[PDB]
Structures are given as C-alpha cells and as structure tokens.
Amino acid sequence: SVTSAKVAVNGVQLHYQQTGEGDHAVLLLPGMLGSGETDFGPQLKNLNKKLFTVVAWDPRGYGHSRPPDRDFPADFFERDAKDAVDLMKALKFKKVSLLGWSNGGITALIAAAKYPSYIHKMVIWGANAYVTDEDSMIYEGIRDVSKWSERTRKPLEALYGYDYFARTCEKWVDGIRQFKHLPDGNICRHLLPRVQCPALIVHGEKDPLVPRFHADFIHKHVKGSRLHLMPEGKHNLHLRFADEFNKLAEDFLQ
Ligand SMILES: [Mg+2]
Ligand SMILES: [Mn+2]
C-alpha cells in the first residue's frame, strides 16, 4: 500500500510516494526524467515493509513535481541533493539510507558527502562522477526520444506528454554535457573522498549508458565501498532483475 503526496521544500511542491512501517528509512532517487512511479515500481512494492519505511521522490521538474519545469544549471545535481535531504527532513526522518539510480546515484553520492551525519548507508547503480567523450557521445545517441524503444518511451510520454518529454530530454543532454568543459569533466569526483558511509556500488556489465570504468572509479575513491558486478545486468537492472537487486540492497542495508 503506497501513499502519494506533496511536501513544500525550497520553493517547490515535491511529489513522492511512501510505503512501509519499518524503522529504517530509505529514499529511492530516480534517474534522468525519472519518478517514483516510473523508476521504482518493484522496490515500492517488494522492499521489506517491516524493516523499512520507503519513500520515492520526484526531483523538481520531474515526475509530478511540476511546477516548476525542469532546467539544468551548473549545480543542478547539488540542488537535487539538497532537495532530497530537505524532503526527508520535511517528512521527519532523522537519518536515512539512499538507493540512487543513475543521475539519482550521482545525487546520492553528493548528499552523503555534503550531509554525512544524515546518511546511514547507500546503494547506487549506473552513476558517473564525471563526463568523458565516450559519455558525451552516448548521451547524444539518447537525445531524441523518438529514437527510443517504444517500450522505454511509452511510460515517460504518458507521464509528461511527448512535447515535455522530448524537450526535457534535450535540455538534459545539454545539461549533462556542460560538465565536459570543466576541469576533469567533473561532476563529483571531489566529493567521493568525503563519502563517510558504507556504500554498495552495483553495476550491470552490459550497461549500455554508463561504461563500467565509472563504477570502478567510484569504488576506488569511496572509502570502504563495495562494488558488485552483475553479468547480465544493463542500466535498468533493478527493474530487469528486481528480486536479485532487492535482495542485494536489503542484505547490505541491514
Ligand atoms: Mg584530472
Ligand atoms: Mn510522483
């Protein structure tokens, strides 16, 4: 049983979903253009409701956190990280663990580094702490939503409507693209050494959007982190292998 609602945080009404009664609060952070509704169906239903209290948020401009419309300033990842922790604080949790997928994992790495006393543990997958030419190219091939597989496009076209969907996707490529021009193509390489909580980095060896070197780099610099490779996993491994991923995360969080 899942409840959806909005809460006022930093000038925006953020939408989120909540389920469970457990004393271990967990925030599910979605990837680009994501939402609790489209990115975390299997988690919101299957994660142990006895052990955890699960919340899936919609970053401003994504999901149902509209208005406002999504924009991508130089600090958009840090802004999402602030909103994410302020949202959990708004919901009265005193500490939380984080499950971050893709851009959501980047956000989670940032939150843990900036608000270490608030974060217990974290599980991230498909994140990249910087942008390279290989990434830049990958993102260019993702730009046009029309070129997306009817399956991957259906839920998002339904959520936002084509126009907003395709357009936001464009601004995202332009937004994630801006980092290549900073020293080291940096997004958060400098914050990895500041992550102080136990971290589990999962990576699908067949992930087509994020090269494995990004998972190896984050494992290397996040002290005490563990890196788990899934031979058949792709970028959406928590959906394609929900039961397998869920056990991995639940075993790690306890
Ligand atoms: Mg360098
Ligand atoms: Mn929502």
Active-site residue, 228 included: no
Choosing from 24, 214, 221, 235, the catalytic residue is 235
Tell me the β-bridge partners of 55: 18, 27
> 185: left (phi > 0), else alpha (psi -120 to 50), else beta?
left
Measure the CA angle with vertex 71, ends 94 and 14; round to 5°. 35
Neighbours of 21 (CB within 10 A): 9
Question: CA–CA separation, 222 vs 227, rounded Å?
Answer: 10
Tell me the β-bridge partners of 52: 24
Choosing from 58, 102, 221, 238, the catalytic residue is 102
Please name the residues in contact with 14: beta carbons below 8 A apart, sequence gap of 6 or more: 6, 7, 8, 57, 58, 59, 60, 65, 83, 87
CATH fold of 1-254 reads Rossmann fold (3.40.50)
Q: How far is the CA of 14 from the centre of ligand 2 (A)?
A: 8
Active-site residue, 117 included: no
Q: How was this structure determined?
A: X-ray
Active-site residue, 102 included: yes
Q: Structure resolution in Å?
A: 1.9
Both tokens of residue 151? 């399956």
3-state secondary structure of 72: coil
Residue ranges covered by each domain of the chain:
1-254
Question: CA–CA separation, 21 vs 50, rounded Å?
Answer: 6
39 is in an annotated binding site: no
Question: CA–CA separation, 6 vs 151, rounded Å?
Answer: 28
Choosing from 35, 207, 214, 225, the catalytic residue is 207
